[PDB]
RNA sequence: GAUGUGUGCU
DNA sequence: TCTGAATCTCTTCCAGCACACATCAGGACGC
DNA sequence: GCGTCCTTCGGAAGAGATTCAGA
């Protein structure tokens, strides 16, 4: 199996799972460990947002592959936003400062 | 763009900014044409449009009306995903109590009225009242009246006073309570008190009352008044295949909410009756706390057939939630999956690529080439070319793949050589050729097993996985300085052959002149591979300063080894391939290349090793026949003794002689011992069974089977695998851990019985289930090691500390397990050490003392070195790289900016989850010890015996009555060469200072039944022991002897719970005996199991046992059974008896007797005397009335509890202390683990700091606050004139340790996120974003490696 | 036909392969030696004795 | 032609500012128009950066006095 | 298992002192369950379901 | 999308 | 008869990745 | 066929509530 950019989740905006649909593999939480592990900070920042939940820079990431250019301009992954409104749901008000 | 996130309790005014409208008709997509209801969950007015740009009733359709708002049906017409950042509200008829603030303990609500959780749940759920303004009666401002209460109260105080039931009257609870005059009235009370209960209940109300002034949070805003509602994108209702549509789980709960709702505002408009009302506004209660967080009360409800939905807290708590599911891991593009092969053609920084993977993952690269060249005008134009797939596309596949590394990682990701970078190799097929030499790192063997293949896009992530994540740097284990790209299991078999000899050839005669010239021979076939030649060769050497000068010499070689040494670099002796390499062998010469070479030698030299070792096991054809399998002739010979030794233990069993319990015992040490013996004697018939001629008479060689071949050259097998082919299966191990009574004596060469192999079942089906369902709670163990360690990286280069820990050879049983040099190596030493030239220095003071030092060290014979520690690192917020040592994957001092607490949680937690998915490869073998009885001194020197209290015995010798001595060999120099742990009521046959020759016993006893052997001499009286009550007594009338067995807590009635069954040894005149140089009587307990063969009143000698007790212990000792003590040290439990030590030196003695339990008083010589200890009737004291202790100095015996080391001896000794423990735990199962990372988790245990005195600083009494913020006020108080503040270090679990961090994220995202959430929002804590986790789940670069600077540049630009 | 790895044997006691491996080269030494004298058309005679 | 990187970690001795390093350097090879200083021999720009880097006429010092050189060379091209 | 009368031994980790305690279970093929248990202080208490 | 079952390698 | 010690009771945790299949989604009653 | 609707059962550990006992 192989997955380029192809169809993404509903609720939080990530890449779908399985080889019968156009699914990525997942990079798990004991795989974000061993990158920690290497200081790879950069490698770690585009697998959890420039290829995951973020979204504008996921397309734009894309246009510069495609534009000769190797350069991330990355954002705030969306099922970080999803945890927020989850968090907010309740009783709870959390935000992020300036 | 932001540096903090701030949680804290939401107001209902917030609640109602937040919204964008009011949903309230509980009516989702009408099930028609897929519109959204008036007011429903689903609202295009509300939240916002379903389709982009495009109003709904059909008013406005383009961009060229954005931000308008419709007037038909009132929807703004924006982008279509501004649905998922638009939330509602529901104004609920009545108020309503927040769930987490009620049934979280301790309850926030509970512990802010001053009222039992019992009381306000009733309160809530409409069950009593409570009495808000009481006013002129007798009833308080929190009394509880039920229904019958209630009707007197207004029958017979039927004034102005009102007493309501429900959340209303919690909610004028909260508002009506003054914060703080309750705080200061509280604080009075507290300063009155004097109970320790009272003080805490107190002062943690205090807290709550504190924390809830300082911040903006009000107690009246723990009750809702306003429902917030998610936004529809985050709760979506996905059409299926025909008109239903799915079942949401979080839907359906709004839709029971505001059906309650609803119900209860039309019945507040038509004047109900009071109960239906009160019972509508109980099922709202009910509906909004399974809505908040389902099943925290009674019953969680259920949707269809049986099953609980999940809540707004199930979907953000759990391992199926928003942390840990999608914020802590993320499924990635540009990712592949595939199986592997082998393909050994590579090379160490290649792979394989199948050429249709690398054509679907480096996709838009292709694209970006195909417009470049112009193949192609648009984005279509060259995806329908690479769909096509045409014969242009590979050239721009091979040009865009040529030095792009690819990242390979296996599922189980235990340390973090499980993911390294490739340059790939197209090639045709569908599976991922994977280099030989990397699959010893990653566990991956090639028998169906996955490798997942990522894509590094930026340049950044290239460099990063060119520079860092390269195979080609990987060749040292981040755990141990060990090489982990190791030749494994076949090129080791190939060395194993070629550098070998026997003692014949087609020439052996014959001397050559170089390496060149054993090739010719070897392939000319006119000279064996085993032959023994005189081959000239020039080796170099760099003993200058970098030069490699030849010397030429001829040496008495084989052939195998000249034509090895053809890839050997220039630069090492040859006194490494002449010899028969095993697989540690080249493991040592690998590092021996890496040491004195360097990378890029030793990639080039693993390499060439291996493609050697593949061709010349090819040209050898080891195979493994069914002759290969000697079965030696005289295994049942051995079978027959064992079994009449077990015939004779049965018959000394049944007579009376034992217990059923060490029956048990002793036939598991005989069988234990049988199999041994068989195993050494198949040993001795396969190792050396090769007679041949010397071209004259016979002679004796190592054999060339090839059993024994990849037995002895470690490719894959060892003793007990090998033995249980042609030796004995031995005995089993079942599942709990009991070994097996009856063993098995055939071997995999013969059959097996119907019956034996039911009996091998039992281990073989132990061995399978073991890693299934117990590498569960070692892959826990890493987790939350992981998750306590991730924020430690190193900040500093040196601190300037003289501090640090004392290493020295562990010899703790048997010989040097750990010499100097293996704990030692790489790390910054502490004071300059002292050769035996004592007053000149060896090594200065802040040396990174490598391989040349250890030499150094070693030339000079030290024994102890005071090496620097991390525990005792003075940086603040992380390590120095001095005060860490090593990298220990590199051999150079750890860089600036390395996240070394999660290299160290990996290396400690996965030896064990490895080697517990590794227990069936033994098949089921019981793996036990032999139960060593004797003392047996190997080398020469005399004795000194340490912390013993010994007596005479009856022959004249020395008997031990002391629990933790130690018998250590001393020898003629005055440095220990051999150490040995005696027990309890050990017989010696020799003493302490006297020198043994090398080869005798000295200490000899029972493995099992340790006595409770006395000191003095008399009668013995059975006191406060009747039969029935606390003994099981059974006589044998014909000799008219008693043995009685006392029980234990078990069978022991309650009535007789406090008689205390023991032995008085008493004179002929009934007058109390003293132990010598005490005034206390011989007074011995007896414990639980225990039996005696003696009869009541008779005399007795010095130092002979009264009474013994069985030991029971039994289990298969592997790394399952055997790692809740890795758990249990690094959480910090509290053993059953703690060892009772010295809380302050002083002089020693008894005051007040028998307060329950026995009392002691310490008084120092000078100082104040206040310490008074409470002993139980337990244990005895080893301190008598009149001697001398120190602090940390142990009263009683037993295991030592982890906390009173470190409140006592300091920090130093805890950590050694769990480092040994650890360490011995690990060394066991012939785990290597570097001291390092023990250390470091150590470390990040040790961060909480209790107050002792404010002093001039800011802290609190007994506030818990963390050890860094103490030591920088302190530091910065006394740079003036102001004092500090004194504290006391704390010890907490890996668990709490990590619960109780000072960022909430973490805490949050690891364990009890709603607990700890509730804990953030009341104290409307601040998360500054400062460790790992934090970072990745905010979605930044982590602070630990290459973006360490870049976090350093942010931090200090603000 | 296909060339498999000594060392796996050892390693994991499933010397059952190896017996099988052997009993097969003899069930398949036997098939050849009736193969052996049936393409050359022999008696039955021969067949039967054998 | 890059296998290992090790002798431009002894160039630049932290192994984590090399690759901000190497990387600023081939973010300057690709997007603008700076061509090597070294003869590339068809290799991608991470690659020819490392080799740079390991050649010795390159640092994160000479980088950022390069790159201010230029700066002002643009500034006085300003008029 | 079988429907009847099992007499389950509950043995060890329990009140922490080491007493084994006793319970008896009456498991139905169709109905409610009437386990019998001991106490640390050995006295019988019944538990439905 | 969630459940339920089976399965592969650790 | 007040206050530590013990016991009782409630709570939270129990490895990773991947593949295949089916089933659900209101089903009762009015129309 | 459309369609509105309103069981019990593991197991170790820790915290916080009772409850004992003992001076
Ligand atoms: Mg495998
Ligand atoms: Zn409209
Ligand atoms: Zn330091």
Redesign the pocket.
């Known amino acids: 199996?192989a997955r380029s950019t192809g169809s993404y989740?509903?609720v939080t905006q990530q890449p779908?799972?399985?080889?019968?649909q156009f699914?990525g593999?997942?990079f798990?939480?004991?795989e974000v460990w061993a990158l920690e592990a290497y200081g790879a900070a950069y490698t770690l920042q585009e697998m959890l947002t420039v290829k995951s939940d973020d979204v504008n820079g996921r397309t734009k990431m894309y246009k510069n592959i495609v534009d000769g250019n190797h350069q991330m301009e990355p954002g705030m992954p969306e099922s970080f936003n999803v945890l927020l409104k989850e968090i907010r749901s309740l009783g709870i008000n959390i935000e992020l400062e300036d | 763009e932001f540096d903090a996130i701030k949680i804290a309790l939401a107001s209902p005014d917030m609640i109602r900014s937040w919204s964008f409208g009011e949903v309230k008709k509980?009516e989702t997509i009408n099930?028609r044409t897929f519109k959204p209801e008036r007011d429903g969950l689903f609202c295009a007015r509300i939240f916002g449009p379903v389709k982009d740009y495009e109003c709904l009733c059909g008013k406005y359709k383009r961009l060229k009306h954005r931000g308008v708002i419709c007037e038909k049906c009132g929807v703004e017409v924006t982008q279509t995903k501004v649905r998922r950042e638009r939330m509602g509200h529901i104004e609920l008829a009545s108020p309503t109590a927040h769930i987490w603030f009620l049934?979280?303990?301790?309850?926030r609500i509970?512990?802010l009225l001053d009222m039992?959780?019992?009381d306000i749940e009733r309160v809530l759920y409409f069950e009593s009242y409570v009495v808000i303004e009481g006013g002129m009666t007798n009833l308080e401002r929190q009394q509880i009246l039920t229904e019958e209460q209630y009707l007197d109260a207004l029958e017979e105080f039927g004034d102005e006073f009102d007493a309501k039931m429900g959340a209303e009257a919690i909610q004028a609870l909260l508002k009506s309570m003054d914060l703080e005059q309750e705080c200061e009235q509280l604080r009075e009370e507290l300063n009155e008190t004097?109970?320790?209960?009272?003080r805490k209940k107190l002062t943690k109300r205090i807290k709550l009352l504190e924390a809830f002034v300082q911040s903006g949070n009000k107690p009246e805003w723990m009750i809702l008044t306003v429902l917030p509602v998610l936004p529809p994108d985050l709760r979506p209702l996905?059409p299926?295949?025909g008109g239903?549509?799915?079942?949401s789980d979080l839907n359906d709960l709004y839709?029971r909410v505001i059906?309650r709702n609803n119900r209860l505002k039309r019945l507040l408009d038509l004047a109900a009756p009071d109960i239906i009302v009160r019972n509508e506004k109980r099922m709202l209660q009910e509906a909004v706390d399974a809505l908040l967080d389902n099943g925290?009360r009674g019953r969680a409800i259920t949707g269809?057939?049986?099953?609980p939905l999940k809540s707004l807290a199930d979907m953000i708590?759990?391992?199926?939630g928003r942390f840990?599911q999608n914020l802590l891991?993320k499924?990635v593009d540009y990712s592949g999956?595939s199986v592997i092969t082998v393909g050994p053609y590579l090379r160490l920084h290649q792979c394989g690529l199948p050429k249709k993977m690398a054509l679907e993952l480096f996709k838009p690269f292709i694209y970006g080439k195909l417009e470049l060249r112009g193949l192609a005008t648009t984005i279509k134009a060259a995806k329908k070319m690479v769909e096509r797939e045409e014969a242009v596309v590979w050239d721009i596949l091979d040009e865009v793949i040529r030095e792009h590394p690819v990242l390979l990682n296996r599922?189980?990701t235990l340390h973090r050589l499980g993911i390294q970078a490739f340059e790939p190799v197209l090639i045709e097929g569908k599976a991922i050729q994977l280099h030989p030499l990397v699959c010893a790192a990653y566990?991956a063997?090639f028998?169906?097993?996955?490798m997942a293949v990522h894509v590094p896009l930026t340049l950044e992530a290239q460099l990063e996985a060119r520079a860092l994540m390269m195979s080609t740097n990987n060749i040292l284990s981040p755990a141990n300085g060990e090489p982990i790209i190791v030749p494994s299991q076949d090129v080791v078999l190939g060395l194993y052959y070629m550098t070998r000899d026997c003692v014949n050839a087609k020439g052996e005669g014959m001397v050559l002149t170089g390496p060149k010239e054993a090739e010719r021979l070897y392939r000319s076939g006119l000279a064996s591979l085993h032959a023994r030649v005189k081959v000239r060769i020039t080796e170099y050497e760099k003993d200058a300063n970098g030069e490699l000068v030849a010397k030429t010499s001829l040496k008495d070689t084989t052939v195998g080894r000249a034509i090895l040494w053809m890839i050997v670099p220039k630069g090492l002796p040859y006194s490494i391939v002449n010899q028969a390499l095993g697989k540690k062998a080249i493991s040592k010469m690998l590092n021996t290349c890496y040491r004195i070479l360097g990378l890029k030698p030793t990639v080039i030299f693993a390499d060439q090793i291996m493609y050697t070792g593949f061709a010349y096991a090819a040209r050898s054809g080891a195979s493994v026949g069914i002759d290969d399998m000697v079965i030696p002739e005289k295994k049942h010979e051995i079978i027959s003794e064992a079994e009449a030794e077990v015939a004779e233990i049965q018959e000394q069993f049944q007579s009376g002689l034992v217990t059923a319990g060490e029956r048990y015992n002793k036939v598991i040490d005989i069988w234990a011992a049988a199999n041994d013996r068989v195993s050494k004697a198949m040993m001795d018939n396969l190792q050396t069974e090769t007679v041949i001629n010397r071209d004259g008479q016979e002679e004796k060689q190592v054999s060339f089977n090839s059993i024994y071949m990849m037995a002895d050259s470690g490719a894959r097998g060892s003793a007990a695998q090998i033995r249980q082919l042609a030796g004995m299966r031995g005995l089993m191990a079942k599942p709990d851990g009991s070994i097996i009574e009856t063993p098995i004596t055939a071997n995999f060469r013969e059959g097996l019985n119907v019956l034996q192999y039911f009996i091998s079942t039992h281990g073989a089906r132990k061995g399978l289930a073991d890693?299934?369902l117990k590498?569960?709670?070692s892959?826990?163990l890493t987790?939350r090691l992981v998750d306590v360690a991730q924020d430690l990286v190193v900040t500093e280069d040196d601190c300037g500390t003289h501090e640090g820990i004392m290493m020295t050879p562990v010899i703790e049983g048997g010989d040097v397990k750990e010499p100097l040099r293996d704990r030692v190596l790489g790390r910054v030493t502490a004071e300059d050490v002292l050769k035996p030239g004592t007053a000149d220095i060896l090594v200065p003071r802040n040396t990174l003392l490598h391989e040349q030092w250890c030499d150094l060290l070693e030339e000079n014979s030290v024994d102890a070195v005071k090496v620097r520690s991390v525990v005792s690192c003075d940086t603040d917020f992380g390590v120095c790289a001095h005060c860490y040592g090593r990298d220990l994957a590199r051999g150079h001092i750890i860089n600036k900016g390395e996240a070394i607490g999660v290299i160290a949680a990996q290396s400690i937690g996965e030896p064990g989850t490895?080697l517990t998915?590794?227990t069936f490869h033994i098949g089921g073998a019981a793996s036990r010890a032999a139960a060593e009885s004797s003392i047996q001194v190997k080398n020469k020197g005399s004795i000194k015996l340490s912390n013993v209290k010994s007596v005479v015995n009856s022959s004249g010798k020395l008997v031990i009555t002391s629990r933790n001595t130690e018998l250590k060999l001393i020898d003629e120099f005055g440095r220990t060469k051999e150490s040995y742990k005696v027990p309890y009521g050990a017989v010696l046959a020799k003493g302490d200072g006297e020198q043994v020759a090398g080869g005798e016993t000295v200490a000899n006893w029972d493995p099992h039944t340790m006595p409770v052997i006395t000191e003095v001499s008399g009668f013995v009286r059975f006191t406060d022991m009747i039969d029935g009550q606390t003994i099981t007594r059974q006589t044998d009338e014909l000799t008219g002897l008693s043995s009685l067995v006392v029980l234990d807590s078990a069978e022991r009635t309650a009535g007789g719970k406090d008689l205390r069954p023991a032995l008085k040894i008493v004179d002929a005149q009934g007058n109390d005996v003293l132990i010598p140089g005490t005034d206390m009587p011989a007074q011995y307990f007896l414990p639980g199991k225990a039996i005696v063969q003696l009869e009541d009143g008779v005399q007795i000698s010095s130092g002979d046992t009264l009474a013994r007790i069985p030991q029971e212990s039994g289990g298969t000792k592997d790394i399952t059974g055997g790692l809740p003590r890795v758990a249990?040290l690094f959480?910090a439990?509290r053993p059953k008896e703690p060892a009772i030590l010295a809380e302050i030196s002083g002089i020693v003695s008894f005051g007040k007797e028998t307060?329950?339990k026995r009392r002691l008083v310490i008084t120092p010589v000078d100082g104040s005397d206040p310490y008074e200890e409470?002993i139980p009737k337990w244990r005895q004291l080893n301190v008598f009335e009149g001697e001398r202790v120190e602090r940390g100095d142990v009263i009683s015996d037993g295991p030592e509890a982890p906390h009173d080391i470190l409140r006592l001896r300091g920090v130093h000794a805890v950590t050694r202390y769990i480092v040994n423990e650890v360490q011995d735990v690990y060394r066991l199962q012939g785990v290597k683990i570097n001291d390092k990372h023990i250390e470091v988790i150590v470390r990040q245990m040790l961060r909480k700091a209790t107050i002792v005195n404010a002093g001039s600083s800011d802290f609190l009494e007994g506030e818990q606050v963390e050890y860094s913020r103490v030591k920088i006020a302190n530091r910065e108080l006394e740079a003036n004139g102001k004092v500090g503040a004194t504290y006391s270090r704390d010890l907490l679990?890996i668990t709490?340790a990590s619960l109780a961090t000072e960022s909430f994220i973490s805490a949050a995202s690891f364990?009890?996120?709603?607990?700890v959430l509730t804990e953030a929002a009341v104290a409307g804590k601040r998360d500054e974003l400062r460790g790992l986790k934090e970072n990745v789940i905010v979605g930044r670069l982590i602070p630990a490696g290459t973006g360490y600077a870049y976090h350093q540049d942010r931090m200090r630009r603000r | 036909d296909i060339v498999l790895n000594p060392l796996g044997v050892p390693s994991r006691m499933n010397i059952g392969q190896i017996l099988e491996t052997h009993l097969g080269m003899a069930a398949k030494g036997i098939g050849d030696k009736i193969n052996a004298m049936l393409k050359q058309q022999q008696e039955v005679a021969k067949l039967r004795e054998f | 032609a890059r296998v290992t990187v090790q002798d431009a970690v002894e160039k630049i001795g932290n192994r984590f500012d090399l690759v901000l390093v190497a990387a600023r350097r081939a973010r300057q090879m690709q997007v603008g128009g700076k061509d090597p200083l070294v003869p590339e021999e068809n290799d991608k720009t991470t690659v020819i950066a490392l080799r740079e880097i390991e050649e010795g006429l390159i640092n994160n010092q000479i980088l950022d006095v390069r790159e201010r050189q230029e700066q002002q060379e643009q500034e006085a091209a300003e008029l | 298992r079988s429907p009847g009368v099992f007499f389950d031994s509950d043995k060890g980790?329990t009140?922490?002192?080491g007493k084994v305690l006793y319970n008896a279970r009456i498991i139905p093929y169709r109905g409610?369950?009437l386990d019998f248990e001991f106490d640390?202080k050995d006295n019988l208490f019944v538990r439905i379901?």
């Open positions: 199996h989740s509903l779908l799972g399985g080889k019968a699914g593999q997942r798990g939480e004991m | 509980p099930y049934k979280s303990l301790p309850s509970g512990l039992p959780l019992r004097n109970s320790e209960t009272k996905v299926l295949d239903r549509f799915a079942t839709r059906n925290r269809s057939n049986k099953r708590k759990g391992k199926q840990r891991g499924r999956r599922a189980p566990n063997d028998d169906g097993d996955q890693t299934a590498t569960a709670n892959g826990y987790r490895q998915m590794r249990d959480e439990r307060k329950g409470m679990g709490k364990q009890e996120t709603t607990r | 980790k009140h922490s002192s409610s369950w640390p379901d």
